[PDB]
Amino acid sequence: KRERMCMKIENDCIFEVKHEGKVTGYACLVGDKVMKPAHVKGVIDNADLAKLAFKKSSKYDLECAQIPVHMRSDASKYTHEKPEGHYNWHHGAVQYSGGRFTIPTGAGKPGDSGRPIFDNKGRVVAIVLGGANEGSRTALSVVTWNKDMVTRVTPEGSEEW
Amino acid sequence: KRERMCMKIENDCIFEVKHEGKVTGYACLVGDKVMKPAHVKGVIDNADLAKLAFKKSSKYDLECAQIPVHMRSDASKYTHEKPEGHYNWHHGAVQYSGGRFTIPTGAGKPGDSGRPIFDNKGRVVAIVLGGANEGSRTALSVVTWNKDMVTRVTPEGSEEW
Amino acid sequence: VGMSLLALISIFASCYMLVAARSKCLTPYALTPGAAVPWTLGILCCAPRAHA
Structure with a gap:
């Protein structure tokens, strides 16, 4: 139920970014803005997305751009509330404890950067x-949103994937 | 049920301090900081934790240091709320009444300093x-916490175990 | 020589007292898993620049 809805949303709101023929990251649709990690390199497998003008900011390691009108209905719904507990993810379920995002499985692999972390109701966190x-x-180094602000939380010793 | 979980947390988060071949105290991992009373002298029975630089403050009789990255997941979680009632301990249960920690049997022994007092949910207090x-x-001479301030509570006639 | 030595002693004592006051003001914040109050961080420089 929840897993099926989450994977359907991921299918509808994730575009692979391939460099030299191999995928290195994922760019996701959130709200009405295209979001992709800045540190990854490559091009989005989409004619409409690849032609946009991507704003750059090295402080948050994030690239943002405005989505076209005809993919607005194919974008996730955002939120800013982060209650303590469990959250969904593509490779399992992630745990929120003490202001940190941690992986129960410990199977983090390079190339999974950019995949949104989902909420119970399908919202993105x-x-x-x-x-x-x-x-x-x-401990995950994730980019979240406040009420009206972006913040970056990076635990010590983190490595970019 | 609670006892088994408390003993598991204590096994994974408490280390004995060896001095001249005899145990003098315990060092626990709370949050992200190593804990050790200052008046207790010795060395941690752990190669990794022995090399950390400790920041001493004789006002609160506590020495703290940043825990290594690879022991972060094997550390307890904390809280700053102390509702009236009872709390668990390795030597039984402790009575918290009127801002006082009291031992029902007086079974405390010297050399047992550094053993955290746990909450009903397994958190450290x-x-x-x-x-x-x-x-x-x-009565217990204990180092408790405010929201962000360490406070050292010492009843009259306390003796440093 | 006497005046120079006295001046150096006085300036060293003042600098040591400033350092000790800084350490005494920022000692309880390393015994909690809490924030450093950036208002105090700006005035009182500390070793953690961005972490914690």
Whole structure:
């Protein structure tokens, strides 16, 4: 139920970014703005998305652009509330404990950057950039949103994926 | 059920301090900071934790240092709320009444300093230093927390265990 | 020589007292997993620049 809806939303709101023929990151549709991690390199597998003008900002390691009108209905719905507990993800379920996003599985691999972290109701919470090896776990370095502000949370020792 | 979880957390988050071949205290991992009472002298029975630089403050009788990255997932979680009632401990249960920590049996022993007092949910509340013998009971000289401030509570006649 | 030595002693004592006051003001914040109050961080420089 929840997993099926989440994977359908991911299918409808994720575009692969391939460099030299191999995928290196993912750009996702959130609200009405195209969001992609800045540190990854490549081009979006989409004629409409690849031609846009991507705003750059090295402080948040994020690229943003305005989506065209005809993909507005194919974009996720955003939110800013982050209650403590469990959140969905593509490679499982992520845990929010003490202002940190951590992976129960500890199977973080390079090339998964940019995949949104989802809420219970299908809303998007943050964006994955990298993680720091917390032994059996890893603490995620994610870009979230405040009420009206962007913040970047990077645990010590994190590596970009 | 609660006892097994508390013992598991204590096994994964408490280390003995060895000095001259005899145990003098315990060092616990709370949040992201190593904990150790200052008056207790020795070295942590752990190669990784022995090399950390400790920041001493004799006003609160506590020495703290930043935990290594690979032991972060094996550390307890904390809180700053102290509702009236009872709390768990490795030596039984402790009575919290009127802002006082009291030992029902007076079973505390020297060398047991550094054992955290746990919450009903498995969270850490305060770190014990010594006990004051008040008749059959024994009040605890403990290092507790405000929202962001460490406060050292010391009843009259306390002796540093 | 006497005047120069006295001046150096006084300036060293003042600098040491400033450092000790900084350490005493920012000692309780390393014993909690809390924030450093950027208002105090600006006035009182500390080793953690961006982390914690």
